[PDB]
Design a binder for this molecule. Structure first.
Ligand SMILES: Cc1cc(Nc2cc(-c3cnn(CCN(C)C)c3)nc(Nc3ccc(CC(=O)Nc4cccc(F)c4)cc3)n2)[nH]n1
Ligand SMILES: Cc1cc(Nc2cc(-c3cnn(CCN(C)C)c3)nc(Nc3ccc(CC(=O)Nc4cccc(F)c4)cc3)n2)[nH]n1
Lengths: 289, 289
């Protein structure tokens, strides 16, 4: 079937193969979508003499076919994209042991954990700078005809210099032909981040990510808050279609909240595009000086 | 879409509704397939005066549509089956809070944890008695035209008197019409427990469960061992089709190992049925006396 053909295709791309003897695994940083993330160090990686610190994405115990397929999908997307605000890929280990992906290591970890451990001194301007970088990256992925589908604070990484990096591409899909990706079965993205049409019609486009980007903005202004607090995920069906959205979060400007509301418009065509979301954030920072 | 129609259908079955004020949640026993399992106590449950200890299956934080659909599926199967070796359902809480399923509590927990914490004095006969009960239960589910699809040691519960209970019905499906369930997308069952045709053709029948029952027998004789030890799950594709199986585990009889091999025959029709798997286990115990 489909997965057995992909796996065999892998065992056959030398520019990405890395010897296993030069890889040393370390502590478990956390549990990913299709497995576990591990801190490691690589010797003579990509012509970089000496050891280099890196992160390894691998399958955990009792991996299912969907998790294996998701690991192969992320490897196929990362080796195509290149942008300062998207996690960089270095290689993979496919022979003489389990399947490993070698990616960039981010000092400060995920954006959610970085924010929940702050009040760290962070101003409103730095919060706007973070969102701007994320829009610069999503603007680049959309131009490559890709839908992330799982855009949230936990899927963003914070590297040296507080530079955002979009990560976790396991659920990403290509949409060059139809401009949309449709899933017949039930998806595996958290409900509270999904667009209304994605939740009801299983349609995923570049405008569905705009919805998720509005929830991500809500997470940032609330410094790692949980969306729709105190609402069972099974109730969002009747709440969203009736026209209800999250209320004004404290420590938020009327312009920031208005930008969120526009990302949550029922009609996808009425929602803004990433190119315009950047201009809005851009002017929100030049005025507060 | 499909899930939004099921959820609305739920909010409309009084014989299973239980008031929330009579439910008191406790410690987290563990993390389930679609969420978390919690130890609780229910007041005046099913005409049983006083408090009764129970287990609650609920959605965890950031639940996805697939996890919600799986919670609704288990609720639909459990309210149809009734057998001494299948977990019993008591009710559910659907109004005035999150979605909860109230099921039977098993003193000793899962069969895997029960075995890994033993050497507890367990003989070969008691190991045969455990497998026999599990076959009695699967024989009853097959007669109801149901495929469990996720039969393993962690999905079995051990109750008072060391009586087995088949649990975790989230991935179970009905097969009354076609006698088989086919999944177009990639499944979510651990590879090392899947039948070869399930892994390649995405076909699930009552004979696919026999394959999984043979791996479960391997877990029991090895007292909670991990199948195919030291083999990446992505390699099972080429290993299974080439005709390789797990080797003779120590502390195992030639008849017990031969029963396993028959559950692993490539041709599903050549594999035995549960009615015959019981007779084999039955005579394996009357002779060792
Ligand atoms: C892949 C990668 C990781 C990194 N770097 C780091 C650094 C740190 C870190 C924390 N503290 N300190 C040092 C501070 N100390 C001293 C207090 C460093 N932590 C992490 N954890 C970590 C971050 C992201 C994920 C992926 C993920 O969540 N997937 C997922 C999960 C669930 C659902 C879903 F949809 C997707 C996994 C784990 N990662 N770079 N590249
Ligand atoms: C639902 C239910 C639970 C129970 N009773 C108990 C009792 C105990 C227990 C342990 N020790 N002691 C007392 C001994 N002390 C003193 C040392 C009691 N533990 C558990 N844990 C527990 C058992 C099963 C699951 C479901 C599951 O794993 N789903 C899953 C997960 C991953 C993948 C997948 F495909 C499926 C979750 C958690 N459950 N009855 N009914």
């Amino acid at each position: 079937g489909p997965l057995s053909l992909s796996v065999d295709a892998f065992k056959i791309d030398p520019k990405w193969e890395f010897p296993r003897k030069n890889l040393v695994l370390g502590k478990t940083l956390g549990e990913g979508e299709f497995g576990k993330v591990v801190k490691a160090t690589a010797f003579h990686l990509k012509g970089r003499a000496g050891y280099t610190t890196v992160a390894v994405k691998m399958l955990k115990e009792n991996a299912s076919p969907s998790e294996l397929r998701d690991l192969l999908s992320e490897f196929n997307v990362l080796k195509q994209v290149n942008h300062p605000h998207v996690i960089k890929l270095y290689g993979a280990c496919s022979q003489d042991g389990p399947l490993l992906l070698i990616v960039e290591y981010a000092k400060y970890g995920s954006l959610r954990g970085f924010l929940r451990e702050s009040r760290r001194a962070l101003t409103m301007g730095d919060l706007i700078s973070f969102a701007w970088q994320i829009s610069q990256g999503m603007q680049y992925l959309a131009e490559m005809k890709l839908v992330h589908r799982d855009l949230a604070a936990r899927n963003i990484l914070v590297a040296e210099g507080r530079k955002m990096k979009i990560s976790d591409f396991g659920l990403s899909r290509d949409v060059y032909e139809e401009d949309s990706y449709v899933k017949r079965s039930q998806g595996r993205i958290p409900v509270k981040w999904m667009a209304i049409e994605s939740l009801f019609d299983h349609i995923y486009t570049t405008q569905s990510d705009v919805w998720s980007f509005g929830v991500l903005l809500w997470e940032i202004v609330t410094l790692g808050g949980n969306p729709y607090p105190g609402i069972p995920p099974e109730r969002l069906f009747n709440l969203l279609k009736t026209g209800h959205r999250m209320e004004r979060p404290d420590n938020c400007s009327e312009e920031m909240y208005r930008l969120m509301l526009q990302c949550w418009k029922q009609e996808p065509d009425k929602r803004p595009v990433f190119a315009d979301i950047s201009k809005d954030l851009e002017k929100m920072m030049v005025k507060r000086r």
